[PDB]
Amino acid sequence: MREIVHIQAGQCGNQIGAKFWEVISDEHGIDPTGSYHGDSDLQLERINVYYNEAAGNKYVPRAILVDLEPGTMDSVRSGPFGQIFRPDNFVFGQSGAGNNWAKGHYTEGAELVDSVLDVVRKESESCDCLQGFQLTHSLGGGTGSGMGTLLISKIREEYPDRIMNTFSVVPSPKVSDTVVEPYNATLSVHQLVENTDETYCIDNEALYDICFRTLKLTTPTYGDLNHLVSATMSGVTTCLRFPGQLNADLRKLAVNMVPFPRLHFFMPGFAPLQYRALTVPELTQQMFDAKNMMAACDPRHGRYLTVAAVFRGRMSMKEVDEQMLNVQNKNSSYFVEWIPNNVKTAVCDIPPRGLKMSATFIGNSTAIQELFKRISEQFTAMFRRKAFLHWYTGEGMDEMEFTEAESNMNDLVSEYQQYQDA
Amino acid sequence: MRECISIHVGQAGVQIGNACWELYCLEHGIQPDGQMPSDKTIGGGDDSFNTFFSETGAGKHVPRAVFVDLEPTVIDEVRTGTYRQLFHPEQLITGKEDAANNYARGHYTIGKEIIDLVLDRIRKLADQCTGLQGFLVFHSFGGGTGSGFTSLLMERLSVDYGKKSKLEFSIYPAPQVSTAVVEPYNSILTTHTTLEHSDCAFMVDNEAIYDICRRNLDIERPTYTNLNRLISQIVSSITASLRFDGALNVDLTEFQTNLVPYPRIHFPLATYAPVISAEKAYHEQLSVAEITNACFEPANQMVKCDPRHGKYMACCLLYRGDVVPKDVNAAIATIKTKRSIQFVDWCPTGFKVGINYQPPTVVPGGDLAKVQRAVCMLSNTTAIAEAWARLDHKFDLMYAKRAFVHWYVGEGMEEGEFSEAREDMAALEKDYEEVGVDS
Amino acid sequence: MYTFVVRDENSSVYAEVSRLLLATGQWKRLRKDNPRFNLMLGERNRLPFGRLGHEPGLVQLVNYYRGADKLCRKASLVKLIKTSPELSESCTWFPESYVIYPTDEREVFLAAYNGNVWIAKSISSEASELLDFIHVIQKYLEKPLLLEPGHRKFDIRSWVLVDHLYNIYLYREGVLRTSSEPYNSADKTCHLTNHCIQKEYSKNYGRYEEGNEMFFEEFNQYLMDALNTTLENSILLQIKHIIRSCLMCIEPAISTKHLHYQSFQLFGFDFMVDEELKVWLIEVNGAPACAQKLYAELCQGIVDVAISSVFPLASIFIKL
Amino acid sequence: MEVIELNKCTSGQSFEVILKPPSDPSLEEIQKKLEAAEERRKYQEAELLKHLAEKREHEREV
Ligand SMILES: Nc1nc2c(ncn2[C@@H]2O[C@H](COP(=O)(O)OP(=O)(O)OP(=O)(O)O)[C@@H](O)[C@H]2O)c(=O)[nH]1
Ligand SMILES: Nc1ncnc2c1ncn2[C@@H]1O[C@H](COP(=O)(O)OP(=O)(O)CP(=O)(O)O)[C@@H](O)[C@H]1O
Ligand SMILES: Nc1nc2c(ncn2[C@@H]2O[C@H](COP(=O)(O)OP(=O)(O)O)[C@@H](O)[C@H]2O)c(=O)[nH]1
Ligand SMILES: Nc1nc(NCc2ccc3c(c2)OCO3)cc(-c2cccc3[nH]ccc23)n1
Ligand SMILES: Nc1nc(NCc2ccc3c(c2)OCO3)cc(-c2cccc3[nH]ccc23)n1
Ligand SMILES: Nc1nc(NCc2ccc3c(c2)OCO3)cc(-c2cccc3[nH]ccc23)n1
Ligand SMILES: [Ca+2]
Ligand SMILES: [Ca+2]
């Protein structure tokens, strides 16, 4: 039955999670009460991937909601689809984590992690055949970052052969809540390097530049960024949520996308970003455009290890193949020659709400090193003077752990560079 | 009468099996409920079609077939489709979780838990045979199950039925219809492990079938249903001699005797003509000479390669429909005077020819037109080694970087197995060069 | 842009073709092992023809015909001539030749013991010197046409381009590669005509013509002034006939009309002219170079007729 | 050319045309190999879980 368990941790994680659930619930014809009111059996044909079936012939998201503070989960429960979530799947503490990875991972978070794992186990136990997990969170705060990576580590320990996938919002000084975000992000990337199979790098810098430059929004809110995130996530889960030609599970996708275990950080993109119907050439050109990428990295500065393209809507598969081939053949130097046929294409007949045609892009590119270099420089700029370290050592962390995290991330960068020059 | 057991492994093998058994039912006059009104012997018989169908006391004609996939989604369509009544449930075996395009997961991790059940169900069918000839094994090279479980299975069938012939029908990977980067690893790994266990293997390149569907059936974007119906026509041409009265290729052993003098060089090239669109409203029917000529055009081959630049070791022609020997012999004389057909020196220059009078069957509402005569050529030519070269080149490109190797090692396969299989492929290419070329 | 790869670093002809293609805007060169090419300029040795034509959405073209080696080696050419009924042992326009290995024509050639001067290659009248030299033994043309001024032997090189449609195009410019020593019946310097061999061992290397190369305008003028005929009538009819017969013989074996990749190839036919203005085929070269003076023009012709014909952008040949 | 071994039945005929004359593993070994692979798997899993137990002890020390 190929069940996925979804986990959203912290403020960012839970807001983007909520948008994800409202968007896909709309695609599957599920209303806020959990009743199906769609027009097509394809909407229900693979519904069990993300939704449990309840007695009242209710479909309930297979979703666990975690935070160290209550605020955001009250806001979820009051949100438009808030009644659809299982009440027992809300697991919240009272203390908060103060944007402090050490509080999320070692002190405040550890007290709550067991109760979160109990709910994960209760959901998995009733799965016909759990394929694995997806987590939504930011890396810049304390709960999603520190407690999220703690959760990931515990899930790996108890489900070591299951796929662990994250949608991870990466911090940027252009959209910043605290100065300590690079510390929290550096500590978290190391964890993801060890304990996830796939991590979608969603950079608030890129989301901001898209809202501002392309969408012409002078003052973009978190709501505007999360609209892009939810549309991207809908796109990336399309190929498993709707009927079609592909017999896939998270492991087959991972095996096709991840050539080396540590290099599993993907750039997502979306097109189109208006009433003019978009031709296949236009979707194809825009989905590969730097300006559509959500991890503010120039793909012309690296090479593609692998690419997945997912097209949604009624269109010519012939025309799709021709345009995808055109972009690969005309830009062959940006695709590594030593992985043949490394661009894969999926088509789903069902378009998202409002757009007639859309494309979602997943790239495993060596250019993602630019993101980690960015974070590393901000980390070093502080860590060379030990600035703000007392917030962390006061929760029991040693300087040594920071030095090791910094080293792990410079090694990740060096590995990406090795494969970019090969 | 001597039985043949068909084994369909993984998605490609199962769906091709579906197309083949549908076609066999139409050819033999067997309905979807299993009844065969033309069969006047109720509940038994030693007719030629009983090589492929057993009979119940209620008159049901039951394929001698096992379907085997490690996830349930493809076989469930068989369980609920038009021919659900044809097959006994114990013939249809599914696990819960597939091999994720990973040879190691099919062969070692998952295969270890289903192999005894599969061999037991196969044994159940064998105990119903009075003179079991062997097995017809349908699978992809590219899937985790089609590659790894199939090779595991072939080893065990060699242990449990060591005297019995085993034939393969193998789907060779094409980027135009496949969605995985690691298909070259799996293909090389399975060919290495299956070689000395397979007596004769018919490779079908999805790229060739794709292009035939596009060019000759005017299909803009062929689906698996199109590809499998065409493939099933070719499979039916190959097995017709086992299923109908006749004097050529009447036993699994004869495929090896006629087509394979070198046991490792056991990959015959199939070429089929004519393929004509059902929608083509004006079709001028093609003569024996034209279709036999078609047999020597690369565009009609199941693997794109150039037989002019290798050598033949054997060649035979299976005609269906309105064909008499005189027209065959005139066609062969003409083709010999017009085309580059070079045999190795130690094999006679010659064709074994089989003709089956019943015309080819097509699936109603299908993409193929009914024709008055058709032909399948099975030729053992060294030119087929071009496909191994292509696959080996892709393997070398990825393995030099160890790309994706960790997925296989993490399932418990050792890295040495990669270079052992690759070495064996290098030796296969060398065998084909020594047989096929001169300085 | 169309895309191409270069895999033979020593080809002068295709180095110039490559540089021409680049100077269009619409061609990009790739690293030698990137498979996403429209056009392969292949290596001379063991070009991987089995890997061509398997890239969805790319029309692929290569500058060699697989199987043309049969025409472009001495033993394979002798065998093709003797064994193909359209050519036959009595070809008349090819010298009597026998394959000899160190299906060995040793005795079959010996039966031709008895003008008995022969050449062994891959020059004497006693067989023992030659068969004790180890290849093909070929009747050596004892009465060559000798140009008056300098009484000197020569050979004619013709360039021929075969396109993907198997049109056979004869480049209108040929070249005579001359000796500049008098021809003697009695020391391989007055007998041979290789460009290198004259620009080294032979003393006079330039006296009569530049680089021992004479072009059609001069040779035609000489044939008019000395023998009262033209190059077209006296020699070129025979050249065209020979080229057409050779390539039409192998067309079924090598054509790419119905194949999944397309081929073209540039050939260099070498001819000898005897004192009766009879033309003899000496050699077919599968990877010729060109005379300096004509590179620019010939390479442009390859782009026009062989490459842009398949990959069009936004006559120096005679069609045979 | 020469046509030999002509056979004929109501369903067809066959024959041959000559244009020119001429000129192991045991079940025990399989079981061992599969079990060695399974042991490697078990070993990788134990390495992972040992690394995670080291992480748990570090968390308690923090
Ligand atoms: N001709 C043909 N090829 C198929 C078909 N289905 C899959 N393939 C090819 O098979 C390869 C994928 O292998 P699958 O059969 O789907 O994999 P599997 O054996 O089921 O193993 P798993 O990885 O466990 O699913 C690709 O190269 C596809 O092109 C089919 O129905 N017909
Ligand atoms: N049968 C014959 N009679 C007279 N002269 C001959 C001959 N065969 C060869 N020659 C002379 O020997 C020269 C070189 O011979 P050949 O053509 O075998 O060399 P080659 O293999 O290098 C081809 P090329 O030098 O043009 O690339 C010819 O130019 C010709 O002058
Ligand atoms: N894109 C996006 N980023 C957010 C959102 N909320 C917070 N962030 C970012 O996440 C980081 C703060 O982490 P936060 O989720 O608030 O901390 P936590 O809840 O304690 O885990 C900062 O980098 C913010 O820019 C959101 O709704 N969308
Ligand atoms: N790796 C990868 N790729 C994806 N894109 C599409 C694709 C189609 C065909 C392919 C292919 C990829 O690769 C081989 O053939 C989606 C995902 C994903 C991630 C996280 C959660 C998810 N819930 C559902 C899906 C999914 N993960
Ligand atoms: N071989 C392999 N695979 C990996 N991920 C996929 C996988 C999951 C479950 C599996 C499996 C493979 O095999 C069967 O169960 C990670 C690793 C690894 C090793 C050592 C250090 C590491 N730091 C980051 C990663 C990593 N090594
Ligand atoms: N995420 C992930 N996966 C891994 N896969 C290997 C694997 C093999 C067989 C399996 C299996 C997993 O699951 C059950 O069978 C290794 C690791 C890792 C990372 C970092 C340091 C490490 N030191 C030891 C290990 C490890 N991290
Ligand atoms: Ca506390
Ligand atoms: Ca009966």
Ligand SMILES: [Mg+2]
């Ligand atoms: Mg915050």
Ligand SMILES: [Mg+2]
């Ligand atoms: Mg499958």
Ligand SMILES: [Mg+2]
């Ligand atoms: Mg020569």
